[PDB]
Every structure is written in structure tokens, then in C-alpha cells.
Ligand binder design. Structure first.
Ligand SMILES: CCCCCCCC/C=C\CCCCCCCC(=O)O[C@@H](COC(=O)CCCCCCCCCCCCCCC)COP(=O)([O-])OCC[N+](C)(C)C
Ligand SMILES: CCCCCCCC/C=C\CCCCCCCC(=O)O[C@@H](COC(=O)CCCCCCCCCCCCCCC)COP(=O)([O-])OCC[N+](C)(C)C
Ligand SMILES: CC(C)CCC[C@@H](C)[C@H]1CC[C@H]2[C@@H]3CC=C4C[C@@H](O)CC[C@]4(C)[C@H]3CC[C@]12C
Ligand SMILES: CC(C)CCC[C@@H](C)[C@H]1CC[C@H]2[C@@H]3CC=C4C[C@@H](O)CC[C@]4(C)[C@H]3CC[C@]12C
Ligand SMILES: [K+]
Ligand SMILES: [K+]
Lengths: 454, 294, 212, 174
């Protein structure tokens, strides 16, 4: 304890103050050593919780050491240079002020050295040769802190302020400058409503080159965070208890598809453990692995949770086109949001760009249609209104036969120009041997042997 | 006080800030107590940038900014006689003819940039508040106050955009070099202005008796010989304020160079990316070789 | 070839405040800090010289003698543009007996005049010909020579520094009390007001938006 | 041109601002004060000698005020109390005679024959000059050599672009 630096700094100031009252005169001796204890500035900013960050406290230590040593060493130069040398009977004074010593030492250790003011006392020069060596040894020691300043100060993301009165989704899993691109172009589309919910992203590895440019292009509605979806600590800071849904993305270009989608199941587990009632939308690379989602006790697809199986839709659209060509490009245009475009030319694409403007929508039909047969309603939708009806829910009934009658509160599915038009369908009022599988859904036969079909 | 020259700028800046604050407060609070914005805004980006229609106003703003600088170099060369000079001739009038144009150009941008609080705190807005008001005070006394007229140098930062509109600086790498180069010559000429202002007019504590007779070109030289770490000390700052500013500029200069020392990615790494045009000499013919070359 | 390209459609409002809220708060803090720092500087920078004038006392002294010394002191006279030429003036000494110190002391116009010549009680505005300097001393000398000892008068003095020099005027006007405690304080007050005012508008804005 | 502009115009305005008049001698005097001057010996002698101060006053024809005459602003700046400075020499006698000889030329022509002289009330009412400080090098060299440099540059660019554009047109003539 006696050899602690804050103990030494008290011994070099308290005793001479109690001598000073005898003569009633202020000895300017080692009273500048009080500057040697503002090193403790980090702790008080750390107790007010202002300097909470583990990286930033190092910067405040290094900064405090420099201003404390600068003010202290200027004190020694003042003391030694103002009161001359013994050898000249102290006749060798240079009339210097403390602020000129603070300046001199700064102009010196910057290697500028104007020489308009400089140390004349032989002791002062001796100290200056020590402080030049000491200063350059000190900077050579602390030149390796670019790990703090350049390497780690750039670690952004760890709070996500929750703006009340809005709602949002969470996107996570596998994100890259291509993987988010087809999503963001359609999610932030101009032809939907002011549905301003997109405010977050979350995955461990930091963003790269033009992904940050793509985020800056949508500065108001991205708000990325570093953090891993397996920690309930990270989920808590992203405010996922408040989120409307959690969209999970997976790389279809994987080296082993049956490893990625299995990994992706436990991303669903981690989320459902933290919070059971949140919507999950996810993508699966293989088909068989889709069964696993039903095991998770709080997965209920009747509340909206669903898994987009890439192999199931990919081979499905292709299979469908073997009955009628172009049906793959037909369906793939009904889901992407797309503006109507005018072309003045008579080229083939003039008529095609009318067709592509058609997205698919759903809406509860008016009470005025209840008790009619499906074909009768579908005529009126296309002749009286300008909407084509595909199907009704009776649990997903597509193009029902005339023998089927519409009841109250049924959804219709429509393929029409813009979401704002479908409401016409709701407001309308007057105006004017074994051969199959166990369910009979598919064809079946007794198992063959591969030698019989090569 | 200083004949309220400085006060005219300082009051019109903070007065506008308080107006916007009060207006934005009351426009909300009145709900709790119980147009040209585009058709002129578009001209403020289409006559001046993006579609390059009509004549680039940014180009006139740039040329008149340099004109005001040249007038500042002339005015600061004279020994500040004040009582009588040739300013009755063009010198003062032509500065007033640029200041009216700047006032109108500021007038156009005031309606444009939606949330006026953020527009008021734009650096090119601040640089206009620190020059336009004291010029209209200057006509009362008929004398040129050398105050913050050197801040006109703070807006030649926009030199990249006009070289980018003439399509001279078409290259995505080379525009970074022109930005970094422009920031250095703009900050150098600006900081030399502060040293001139503070060092020529002495300290309050000595009743302003503490003058050192310095010219703007010696301040441009001093600051260059200082931040190069040479420091001959044949000319240096004597005023106690001047020394204080010099200790700030030495720290600021070395912090700035440490920040921009990581641009070797531009200069050494990417300036060497040759090849992207192949001029076609007519009257000859040629082959193309490609695939795998070593 | 490239169709109609795209469409000109955009509808945004920076939400309400974000970049303006950050900048206005930052500016308020900068004005707060630079107010406190400017007071901290103008403190020990101004108080160190101002204490020396403040320490000087006042009294009501009387003339004791008036003399011509003979020594012709050099002075610099300007010609309106950079003449470093010089001329000379005769030294006059006016002694006073101080009303409190009762000691012989020389009078001096101001500490500037005292520091530039401690052996003479006046310095003329220096001019080209010896005659103009001589008359400019005589004219000031006359005003004391016709009022020796009659009408005691207000004068300034400092025994701590020197018992034998007396001043007709103070060296500092009231700029210190009027400008040192004012402009950094006003700078701090405007900073505090802009922070408080902005936090009022920020906190009120959400409460007004929730009223629907 | 940008450099030679505010570099040359700042001093050149001060001579240009000085006016001309046709003044007359008012008085001639010996002051007594022996001013020091430096005399060279052909190689680095910093030795000095002395000369008697003469003052020639003129009444200015426009300002009608008493003023001292001065050869040039150099002589005025180096001694504002004397109307002449001799070429400084070794012995006191040679300096004295070199003042007397110049004094004689005024002493035999006091007030007769009014003469051309230069003056500037803006700076000072009481000093008058026999000559201008700058010769016509400014108008002749400031607006010339940078301009000639620019003109040669423009000509070499234009000429070369002429040859460059013509060359392909000549090659195509076959
Ligand atoms: C906080 C600000 C420090 C106080 C500055 C006041 C300095 C001052 O009083 O004048 C001093 C001048 O001596 C100088 O010129 C030193 C000026 C350099 C300032 C050093 C910056 C240190 C920043 C960290 C003393 O003035 P003076 O008695 O005229 O000295 C002759
Ligand atoms: C290109 C732009 C050029 C304009 C600046 C160069 C010409 C200046 C004109 C002369 C001038 O003002 O000289 C001054 C001295 O000046 C110096 O001795 C310092 C010179 C500093 C050069 C800085 C280069 C900056 C390039 C950018 C003052 O002259 P004076 O008052 O006669 O001095 C006695
Ligand atoms: C190794 C170093 C510290 C050798 C000692 C230097 C310092 C600490 C010592 C040595 C000589 C001492 C000085 C000599 C005498 C005086 C004159 C007096 O009116 C003020 C104190 C002062 C100025 C002393 C202060 C302390 C002092 C400066
Ligand atoms: C923090 C800094 C800016 C403190 C203020 C310094 C500058 C901006 C202020 C403080 C004192 C002021 C100076 C004091 C008085 C004079 C004398 C006058 O004939 C010219 C202007 C001049 C020279 C003022 C210019 C502006 C000034 C230099
Ligand atoms: K050096
Ligand atoms: K040096």
C-alpha cells in the first residue's frame, strides 16, 4: 500500500501544505502531481454507465494517460526551468509560465520545434533529452492499438431501439448481396401500401462490400444487426417478442442440402423456445425434411406458420408445364409485385407487359352472391366487375362444378390488376385389385423391381 | 460588439434555429392543448445536377465562390486602411453583386430540402450565414470587414461534382482522389484564414496592443511549414490565442493524416488498373486473342 | 431498345426527425461544452493580469515639485506608411506627495507610459521636428505649473509593487466583468436552451402522434 | 498571371495613387545633426562615416502646405528629416562637399522656376517626392510574359490538334 502510486501522489502534496501555514506562503513545489490522478476518469464514466462498452474504455485509458503525462511533465519543466541551476547561484533563471511549458512540450514531442521558446537551464536541457527519448519510446509502445481503434471501433450493431406504434419482421439465416436482393426489391415495392414494417436483419458474420451500399440505398428501413440467432440474449435485444413474423432464408447453392435444412430446423426451435406465438416463414431445400416442423409442439400451420419447400415447388412448376407449356412462367408472374407498363410499339412484349401486371389476391365476397352457383358468380365477377375468380374456400375448392352453391363468409381468390380493385367484390350490392393410394388422390401399382424397367 | 458585424451573422443563424424549433413545437402542441415545394425544388436539382438541363447553377455557384475568394485575397493584401480606399470602385460593388446571387440561391434551397431543421444544419447553409449578413452591414459604414469571408474556401469541396457532370472524372476510383485532394487544399486555406484573423488582431487581455503584423500568404506558408513538421521558426504565432489554435491544428493535422493514411487501396492498389477502351484505328484491321494467356 | 427504363415515384419524409434530431442535440452539447471551456480559458487567462490593476488603490494626492531633467529621450514618429524614423523630447518630472503614503512619487499618465519611461511624468505624441515635441511637453507642463499644490486630485497607487510611482488612470476599462462572464455564459445558456427545447419537441411528438 | 496580379498590384497601387503637382521652394536650412551612413570599400567593409542634414521645404501648388522635398521614397524612408542623402564616402570632407554641391543647386534657384513634383495626401501632407518609385516594368512585364506563355500554349495545342485531325483525313485520301 505504501508503494501504490496514488499513495506516493498524496505524500508529495499533503505534508508541504501543513508547512505552508507557518510562513503563510504558497510553495509551488509538487502540487502539479495532482494531475497524475485524473487517470481514474474511466472508472467514474464506468459507474455512471456512460462507458459501458468493453472496447471504448481502453481508448479513454490511453487518452487519459497522454493528457495526464503531458500536464505532469510540463510541471517538471516549469519547476526546473523557472528556478535556475545551483552552479550559477540560481542567477540562471529563464522567466517561463506554466502555459508556455505546456506549449513547449507539445511543440517538442510533435517534432515541430520552432525554437521561439526552449529550455536554457542546464538541468532543463537534461530533462528535455529524457522527455524526447521517453516520448518516442512511449509512442512506439502504444502504436500497436490499431486493434482497438481501426479493428474494433467499427463493430456496429447492438441495441435496436423499438419505435412504438409500428410493427416489424425479423429476417435471419443466410444473407448476402444476392440473397436479400430479390427479396428487398419486391418487399419494398412501390405498388403496395405504406406498409412500413421492414426495420431489421440478424446474422453473425459482418456485412461486406456492396451489401452495405444496398443497405445505405434503403437507409430508413433495414437497420442490420450483428448477432447469432441461437442466443436468447441476442433475440432479446432484437425485441423479437414484439415482432410480427420471423422470415428464415437458406442457401439453395449449398454443398450438402440435407445438412442445411436440418440445421435450419433448430433455428426454428431456438425462436419458438424464446417465444412460442410468433409466425415463422421458412424455406426448405429437400422435401422429406418438411415433416420435422410438425414435431415442434408450438408449430401450428393453422395460425400461419409455413415452410416453402424449394424442391417441391421447383419440380412442381416444371411438372405442371408438361401438361401445358408456359404454365411455369404464368404462375411465377402472379406472385412478384409488378407495375403496369405502356409500350407504344407492336412488338410481342407490348401484350406480355400487360399480362405481367396481374398479381393474385383474395377477399371475402359480398353477401349479395350467397346462394348462387359458382359459375354464375364467376360470370358476374368478370362481366359486371372486371375480376377473374379462380377458387373459393369449403377448404380450397378450385373451379367448383355448377352443383356447388356459395355460402356466407367464403373467401374468393382473384387474379386482378392491383389490391385496391378487389374490394369491389365485397362492396357489390344490387347497383347494376389395388389401383390408387389409401386416399384415392393418385395412381398406384404393386412395387416393381429395377431390372424390369431398365 | 465590433459594430455588430459578427452579431448580424450570429443572430440570423440562431434566430432561424429558434424559429424552426418554436414552429415545430407549436405545430404539434396545438393538437394536444385540447405546392412550390416540388415545381421549384425540381429546378433546384434539374437546372443544377442529375439531368443537366438548362445551365448548371452549381457551376455558377462554384465560379462566384472562387470570385469571392479572389476578392478576399485582394482585400486582405491591403493594410486595412478603412477610412478611405478605392473600394468606391468595383471591388466592393462586385462582391455585393455575388452576395445577392448567393442570397437568391439560398432562397431556392430553403423551400426544397423538406425538414428545415436538417437544412439549417447543412455545412453549405452555415457557410452562407457566416458571409451574407455582414456584407449587407458593410454598406452602412462603406468599409470591408475582413471577418469570415475566408469560409468561401470551405465550398470548393464541390469540385468533384462539376468534373463529374462534364464527364471528365468518369472513373469510380479517381473521384475519391479528387475528393481527398480537395479536402486538403480547402482545409489548408481555411485554417490559414483563422490564423490570419486571430494572429493579426491581437489578444483582448493586452487591450489588443499585442499585434504581430502578418499577411494571409504568410499564414498559408506558416501552416504548411508547420504541418510538414519542418518548422523553421523564422515566422510563428506570438498571440496567446494564436498559440492555442496552433496546438489544436498540430493535433488535428496529425489525427487527419492518420485517418487518411489507409487510402493506399485507392492510390497504390487500384490506380494501376489499366485497360478499358481500345481506340479503333480506322484503315487497319485486327484479330482478338482470348481464353487462357500466360 | 431499353424500353421506358423505369418510373419516377418516391414518397418519403425522413419519418419526422432523425438526422435533424441528432444534429440539433449534438450542436446543443457542443455549445454547452465550448461555453464551459471558453469560461475556463477566459478565467485564468484574464484574471492573472486583471488582479494587478484591481490590486492598485486610489487616493487624492497633491503636487510636490515640477522639473526639467535635460536628457533628450528618443521617440518614434510615423509618416502614415512604415517610417521607422525617430525624433526626441525633453524629460519633465512631476512629483506628488501621496495623500495616504505621504511619500515623494512621480506622476505617470498610465502604466504603459510608466513602463516606457519610468524617469519622466509625461510622454508627448511624437512628431517630426524637435520644436513640436518641445511645445507638446511645454503645453502639458503648463497645466501643472499653473496648478501646483492647489486642488488635490484623484490618483492610483500600489505599495505592494512600488512606493514611488503614481498613476492618473486605470489600465483596464470594464471590458473584463462585462465580457468574460458574458459571452461564454450566453453561449452555454443558448446551448442548454436548444437541448431542452429539442427534448421537449422530441418527447411531445410521440405523445401527439399517439392522440389519434 | 494569377500570382503576378495581387503580388504586383498591392505595392503598385501605392505609387499609382500618388499625385503630381508643380511646387516651389519655401526655405533651405542646415540642421546640425550629423547622421551616420555606411560606406563600402569594394569588399565587405561595414565601416561608417557621417553627413550634415539639409532640409529643403517646398510649398505645394495644390495643397499650399509646408513640406520637405525627398529624392525618392527610399530616401524618405531612410531619413524623413533630411531632403537629400549623399553617396556615402570615407572622409567627412567628401560627404560634406557632396551635400554642399546638391545644396548649391537649390540655393541659387530658390522659388524661381516652379517644378514638377509628386505627392499623396492620403498618406502624408508634409512630404514631397522628386521621382516615382516604380518604372513602367509593371504594365510592360506583368500583363506580358504570363500572357505570352498562355498564347504559346494555346497555339501549340491548336496547331497539334490541327495536324492530328488532318493526318487521318490525309491517310484516307488514297
Ligand atoms: C486551458 C487554456 C490554458 C490557459 C491559457 C492562458 C495562457 C496565459 O495566461 O498567457 C500566458 C502566455 O503563455 C502562452 O502563450 C501559452 C499559450 C499556449 C496554450 C497551451 C494550450 C494547452 C492546452 C491544454 C502568460 O501571459 P504573459 O504573462 O503575457 O506571459 C508572457
Ligand atoms: C497561387 C496563388 C498565389 C498567391 C500567393 C503568392 C503571391 C503572394 C503575393 C505577394 C504577397 O502577398 O507577399 C506577402 C509575403 O508572402 C510571403 O512571403 C509568403 C508566400 C507564401 C506562398 C504560399 C504558396 C501558396 C500556393 C497556393 C506580403 O508581401 P509584403 O507585404 O510586401 O511583405 C513585406
Ligand atoms: C533530479 C532533480 C529533481 C534535481 C533537483 C531539481 C529540483 C527538484 C530542485 C533542485 C534545486 C531546487 C530549487 C533551488 C532553489 C529554489 C529557489 C526558491 O526561491 C524556489 C524553489 C527553488 C527553485 C528550488 C526548487 C526545487 C529545486 C528546483
Ligand atoms: C474562440 C475564439 C474565436 C475567441 C474569439 C477570437 C476572435 C473570433 C474574436 C475575439 C476578439 C475579436 C477581435 C477583437 C477586436 C478586433 C479589433 C478590430 O480592429 C478588428 C477585429 C478584431 C481583431 C476582433 C475580431 C474577432 C476577434 C478576433
Ligand atoms: K523539425
Ligand atoms: K525546427
Amino acid at each position: 500500500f505504501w508503494l501504490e502510486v496514488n499513495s506516493v501522489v498524496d505524500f508529495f502534496t499533503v505534508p508541504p501544505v501543513f508547512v505552508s501555514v507557518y510562513l503563510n506562503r504558497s510553495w509551488l513545489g509538487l502540487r502539479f502531481l495532482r494531475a497524475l490522478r485524473l487517470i481514474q476518469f474511466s472508472e467514474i464514466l464506468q459507474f455512471l454507465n456512460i462507458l459501458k462498452t468493453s472496447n471504448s474504455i481502453k481508448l479513454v485509458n490511453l487518452l487519459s494517460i497522454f493528457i495526464s503525462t503531458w500536464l505532469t511533465a510540463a510541471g517538471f519543466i516549469h519547476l526546473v526551468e523557472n528556478s535556475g541551476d545551483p552552479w550559477e547561484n540560481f542567477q540562471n533563471n529563464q522567466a517561463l509560465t506554466y502555459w508556455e511549458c505546456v506549449y513547449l512540450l507539445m511543440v517538442t514531442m510533435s517534432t515541430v520545434g520552432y525554437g521561439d521558446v526552449y529550455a536554457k537551464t542546464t538541468l532543463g536541457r537534461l530533462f528535455m533529452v529524457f522527455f524526447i527519448l521517453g516520448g518516442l519510446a512511449m509512442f512506439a509502445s502504444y502504436v500497436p492499438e490499431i486493434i482497438e481503434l481501426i479493428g474494433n471501433r467499427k463493430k456496429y450493431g447492438g441495441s435496436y431501439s423499438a419505435v412504438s406504434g409500428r410493427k416489424h419482421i425479423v429476417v435471419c439465416g443466410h444473407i448476402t448481396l444476392e440473397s436479400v436482393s430479390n427479396f428487398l426489391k419486391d418487399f419494398l415495392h412501390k405498388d403496395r401500401d405504406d406498409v412500413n414494417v421492414e426495420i431489421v436483419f440478424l446474422h453473425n458474420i459482418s456485412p461486406n462490400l456492396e451489401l452495405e451500399a444496398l443497405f445505405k440505398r434503403h437507409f430508413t428501413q433495414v437497420e442490420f444487426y450483428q448477432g447469432s440467432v441461437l442466443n436468447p440474449h441476442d433475440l432479446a435485444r432484437v425485441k423479437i417478442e414484439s415482432a410480427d413474423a420471423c422470415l428464415i432464408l437458406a442457401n439453395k447453392y449449398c454443398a450438402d442440402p440435407d445438412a442445411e435444412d436440418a440445421s435450419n430446423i433448430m433455428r426454428v426451435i431456438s425462436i419458438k423456445n424464446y417465444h412460442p406465438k410468433i409466425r415463422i416463414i421458412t424455406q426448405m431445400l429437400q422435401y422429406h425434411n418438411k415433416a420435422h416442423l410438425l414435431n415442434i409442439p408450438s408449430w401450428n400451420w393453422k395460425e400461419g406458420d409455413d415452410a416453402i419447400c424449394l424442391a417441391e415447388l421447383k419440380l412442381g412448376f416444371i411438372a405442371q408445364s408438361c401438361l401445358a407449356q408456359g404454365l411455369s412462367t404464368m404462375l411465377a408472374n402472379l406472385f412478384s409485385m409488378r407495375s403496369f407498363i405502356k409500350i407504344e410499339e407492336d412488338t410481342w412484349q407490348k401484350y406480355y407487359l400487360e399480362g405481367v401486371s396481374n398479381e393474385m389476391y383474395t377477399e371475402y365476397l359480398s353477401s349479395a352472391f350467397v346462394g348462387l352457383s359458382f359459375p354464375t358468380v364467376c360470370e358476374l365477377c368478370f362481366v359486371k366487375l372486371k375480376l377473374l375468380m379462380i377458387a373459393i374456400e369449403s377448404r380450397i375448392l378450385i373451379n367448383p362444378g355448377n352443383h356447388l352453391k356459395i355460402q356466407e363468409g367464403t373467401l374468393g381468390f382473384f387474379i386482378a390488376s392491383d389490391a385496391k380493385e378487389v374490394k369491389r367484390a365485397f362492396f357489390y350490392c344490387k347497383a347494376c385389385v389395388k389401383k390408387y393410394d389409401s386416399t384415392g388422390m393418385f395412381h398406384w401399382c404393386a412395387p416393381k423391381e429395377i431390372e424390369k424397367v431398365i | 460588439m465590433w459594430w455588430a458585424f459578427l452579431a448580424s451573422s450570429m443572430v440570423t443563424f440562431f434566430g432561424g434555429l429558434f424559429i424552426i424549433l418554436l414552429w415545430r413545437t407549436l405545430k404539434y402542441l396545438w393538437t394536444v392543448c385540447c405546392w412550390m415545394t416540388s415545381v421549384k425544388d425540381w429546378a433546384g436539382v434539374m437546372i443544377s445536377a442529375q439531368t443537366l438541363t438548362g445551365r448548371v447553377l452549381v457551376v455558377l455557384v462554384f465560379a462566384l465562390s472562387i470570385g469571392a475568394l479572389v476578392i478576399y485575397f485582394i482585400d486582405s493584401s491591403n493594410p486595412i486602411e478603412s477610412c478611405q480606399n478605392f473600394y468606391k470602385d468595383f471591388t466592393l460593388q462586385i462582391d455585393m453583386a455575388f452576395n445577392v446571387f448567393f442570397l437568391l440561391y439560398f432562397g431556392l434551397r430553403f423551400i426544397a430540402a423538406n425538414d428545415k431543421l436538417w437544412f439549417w444544419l447543412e455545412v453549405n447553409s452555415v457557410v452562407d450565414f457566416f458571409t451574407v449578413p455582414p456584407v449587407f452591414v458593410s454598406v452602412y459604414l462603406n468599409r470591408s470587414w475582413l471577418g469570415l469571408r475566408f469560409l468561401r474556401a470551405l465550398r470548393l469541396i464541390q469540385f468533384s461534382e462539376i468534373l463529374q457532370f462534364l464527364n471528365i472524372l468518369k472513373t469510380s476510383n479517381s473521384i475519391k482522389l479528387v475528393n481527398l485532394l480537395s479536402i486538403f487544399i480547402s482545409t489548408w486555406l481555411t485554417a490559414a484564414g483563422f490564423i490570419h484573423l486571430v494572429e493579426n488582431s491581437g489578444d483582448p487581455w493586452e487591450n489588443f496592443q499585442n499585434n504581430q503584423a502578418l499577411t494571409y500568404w504568410e499564414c498559408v506558408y506558416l501552416l504548411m511549414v508547420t504541418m510538414s513538421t519542418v518548422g523553421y521558426g523564422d515566422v510563428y504565432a506570438k498571440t496567446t490565442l494564436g498559440r492555442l489554435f496552433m496546438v489544436f491544428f498540430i493535433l488535428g493535422g496529425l489525427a487527419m493524416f492518420a485517418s487518411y493514411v489507409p487510402e493506399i487501396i485507392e492510390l497504390i492498389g487500384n490506380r494501376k488498373k489499366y485497360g478499358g477502351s481500345y481506340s479503333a484505328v480506322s484503315g487497319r484491321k485486327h484479330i482478338v486473342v482470348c481464353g487462357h494467356i500466360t | 431498345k431499353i424500353r421506358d427504363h423505369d418510373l419516377l415515384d418516391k414518397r418519403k419524409t425522413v419519418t419526422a426527425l432523425k438526422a435533424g434530431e441528432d444534429k440539433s442535440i449534438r450542436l446543443g452539447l457542443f455549445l454547452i461544452i465550448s461555453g464551459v471551456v471558453s469560461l475556463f480559458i477566459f478565467g485564468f487567462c484574464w484574471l492573472s493580469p486583471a488582479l494587478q490593476d484591481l490590486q492598485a488603490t486610489e487616493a487624492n494626492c497633491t503636487v510636490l515639485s515640477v522639473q526639467q531633467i535635460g536628457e533628450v529621450f528618443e521617440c518614434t514618429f510615423t509618416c502614415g506608411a512604415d517610417c521607422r524614423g525617430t525624433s526626441q523630447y525633453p524629460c519633465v518630472q512631476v512629483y506628488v506627495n501621496n495623500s495616504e503614503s505621504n511619500s515623494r512619487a512621480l506622476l505617470h499618465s498610465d502604466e504603459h507610459q510608466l513602463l516606457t519611461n519610468p524617469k519622466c511624468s509625461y510622454i508627448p505624441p511624437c512628431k517630426r521636428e524637435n520644436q513640436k515635441n518641445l511645445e507638446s511637453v511645454m503645453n502639458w507642463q503648463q497645466y501643472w505649473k499653473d496648478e501646483i499644490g492647489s486642488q488635490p486630485f484623484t490618483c492610483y497607487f500600489n505599495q505592494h509593487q512600488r512606493p514611488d510611482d503614481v498613476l492618473l488612470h486605470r489600465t483596464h476599462d470594464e471590458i473584463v466583468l462585462l465580457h468574460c462572464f458574458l459571452w461564454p455564459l450566453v453561449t452555454f445558456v443558448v446551448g442548454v436552451l436548444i437541448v431542452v427545447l429539442t427534448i421537449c419537441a422530441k418527447s411531445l411528438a410521440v405523445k401527439a402522434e399517439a392522440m389519434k
